Amino acid sequence: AFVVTDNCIKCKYTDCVEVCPVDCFYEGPNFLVIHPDECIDCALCEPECPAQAIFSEDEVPEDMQEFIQLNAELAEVWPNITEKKDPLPDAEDWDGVKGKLQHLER
Ligand code: SF4
Ligand code: F3S
């Protein structure tokens, strides 16, 4: 599985969804997750994300390991997203700010 990590939050560019062959992204108000059982590890999304938030599971930084289970969890309850949309209004302001997990919206 690939995993969406901290820098997506309050950015949510949604460039990633457009390359995904299997449509395994699920949508929150200010974040995206990947469903780990649906992901085929094609790795195409990783270079697409402007926030560089996406990692191979086996490459998620130690300080962001909690994102692995959180993707799995929220992918069970959020709606599928399969089309690019406009990034969130102040995405530029939040790209690169750390510890945005505190801002995550259910
Ligand atoms: S690795 Fe491939 S299958 Fe998995 S989320 Fe990214 S684009 Fe979709
Ligand atoms: S910011 Fe989030 S919505 Fe996709 S392009 Fe990056 S994982």
The CATH number given to 1-106 is 3.30.70.20
Q: Backbone phi, then psi, for 88, in 5-degree steps?
A: -65, 150
Identify the residue whose C-alpha is closest to ligand 1 atom 4. Answer: 39
Test site for ligand 1: of 15, 39, 41, 74, most ligand atoms within 8 A of the Cβ? 39
Question: CA–CA separation, 65 vs 67, rounded Å?
Answer: 5
Report the nearest atom of ligand 2 relative to the CA of 17.
4
Is 11 annotated for ligand binding? no
Domain boundaries, the chain: 1-106
Residue 16 assigned ligand-binding role: yes
Please name the residue whose Cα sits nearest to atom 7 of ligand 1: 20
**Rounded to whole angstroms, how far apart are CA atoms 65 and 45?**
19
**Contacts (Cβ under 8 Å, ≥6 apart) of 73:** none
For 58, the token pair is 């086996």
24, 34 contact by CB (below 8 A): yes
Name 4's bridge partners: 54
Take atom 8 of ligand 1 and give the residue whose Cα is closest. Answer: 20
Method: X-ray
The DSSP line for 52-81 is --EEEGGG--GGGTHHHHHHHHHTTTSPB-
